Amino acid sequence: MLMVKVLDAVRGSPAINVAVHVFRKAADDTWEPFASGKTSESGELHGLTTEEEFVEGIYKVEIDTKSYWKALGISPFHEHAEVVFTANDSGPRRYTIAALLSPYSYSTTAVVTNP
Amino acid sequence: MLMVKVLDAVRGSPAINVAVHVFRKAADDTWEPFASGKTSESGELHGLTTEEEFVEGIYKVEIDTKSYWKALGISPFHEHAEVVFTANDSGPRRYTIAALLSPYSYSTTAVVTN
Amino acid sequence: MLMVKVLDAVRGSPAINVAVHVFRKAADDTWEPFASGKTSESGELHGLTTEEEFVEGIYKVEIDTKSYWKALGISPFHEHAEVVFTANDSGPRRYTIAALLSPYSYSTTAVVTNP
Amino acid sequence: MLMVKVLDAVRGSPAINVAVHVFRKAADDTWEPFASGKTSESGELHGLTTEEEFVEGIYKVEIDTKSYWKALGISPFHEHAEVVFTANDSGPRRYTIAALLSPYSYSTTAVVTN
Numbered sequence A, C: 001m002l003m004v005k006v007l008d009a010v011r012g013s014p015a016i017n018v019a020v021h022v023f024r025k026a027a028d029d030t031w032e033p034f035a036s037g038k039t040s041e042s043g044e045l046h047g048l049t050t051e052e053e054f055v056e057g058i059y060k061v062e063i064d065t066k067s068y069w070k071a072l073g074i075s076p077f078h079e080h081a082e083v084v085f086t087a088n089d090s091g092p093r094r095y096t097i098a099a100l101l102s103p104y105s106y107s108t109t110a111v112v113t114n115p
Numbered sequence B, D: 001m002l003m004v005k006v007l008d009a010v011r012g013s014p015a016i017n018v019a020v021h022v023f024r025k026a027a028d029d030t031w032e033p034f035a036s037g038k039t040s041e042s043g044e045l046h047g048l049t050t051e052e053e054f055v056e057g058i059y060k061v062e063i064d065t066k067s068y069w070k071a072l073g074i075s076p077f078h079e080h081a082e083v084v085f086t087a088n089d090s091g092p093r094r095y096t097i098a099a100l101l102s103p104y105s106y107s108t109t110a111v112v113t114n
Helices: A065-070 B065-071 C065-070 D065-071
Strands: A002-008 A019-025 A031-038 A057-063 A078-087 A094-102 A105-113 B002-008 B019-025 B031-038 B057-063 B078-087 B094-102 B105-113 C002-008 C019-025 C031-038 C057-063 C078-087 C094-102 C105-113 D002-008 D019-025 D031-038 D057-063 D078-087 D094-102 D105-113
Touching (some): A002 A019, A065 A078, A065 A094, A078 A094, A078 A105, B002 B057, B065 B078, B078 B094, C065 C094, D002 D057, D065 D078, D065 D094, D078 D105
Parallel strands (some): A002 A094, C002 C094, D002 D094
Antiparallel strands (some): A019 A057, A057 A078, B057 B078, B094 B105, C019 C057, D019 D057
């Protein structure tokens, strides 16, 4: 129900092997680890969660942009990119989180569809 | 030495009266309040820090995008936008953090000049 | 070999039924009509061209953003979004042209892969 | 009354010495040169027009992005970036056309203020 897609705006390609960590805000206001993975050769990350597991709450997706640029020999500005949102508060939805990466800039977009 | 600029991509205007909070990373890996304010009529926020207090370290700029959209009666996706970066003395000195806001998308850009 | 994808950053959804016109620069420096279509319900447009037809040259993709926003009751800034690029100059490639639309802003990204 | 600002997203800096050409649509649906220049050290271009010459109509701003990237030795995708818009007297008066450049992506934003 949660997919992450990452593009490289410098090379015009998917961002491959980018680490992604997802957290869920617990009842005590701390960030609990929820899921993690790495983008595939198409720059996508699927299978982070199931419908039963993906309950209502506040989630944070943290994308390790810094390691990505370093391995390409570029010293980027940001430590990472994070996306924080409330999910499922009016029923289950499919969430696609897209990120477009440049060394000193990034964009993030959400596409939300009703399964 | 740190300047924040916020633009509204729906109305083509500065994003006015947006709350901004700046944090510095402490030794215990905790975020401590450092500065804050609200963007002006030109969507800018200046005078958050001085060259003396702005030492090397990791900083987080949090922009309350959700309240901005709610005031316009538009339902947004993100809870806020966060920009996290390391400040380095070698060797460019002025940091402009720009943010371009839409309800389901934002971009942020850093302009670092001397 | 040419695909166009359009997203709506105001609604968090694909941009559906957006008109797209593609032109190729002729030998006399004029823009010849090459192909056209409308984005589907996933905001995508496939099948604009074939490999035999998609020769080396300069192409322009014009996306009718203005009609899209008007039909939603918004008066946008731009007349359209156009993307102009040289294609296939070092052999056939697959081109994905992505556009992210807001009323007073747009972004366009190209993903180029080797078939 | 028309201002162009260009930023480089790879180096986090103003895009300096970028060529900009502005055209106005003629009755024959043809584009006629109207103004031009090169961005300054702050990546800005001012004084392209006056309030008197800037009448209602359709304008095209063409930014030579390809030459900018080539000078840095980076191969870009686009031939240039074009921004086409209608200017309207009712009723906000100053137009800032911003562009944020990467080799395979650009964004453009209009800020229209009074």
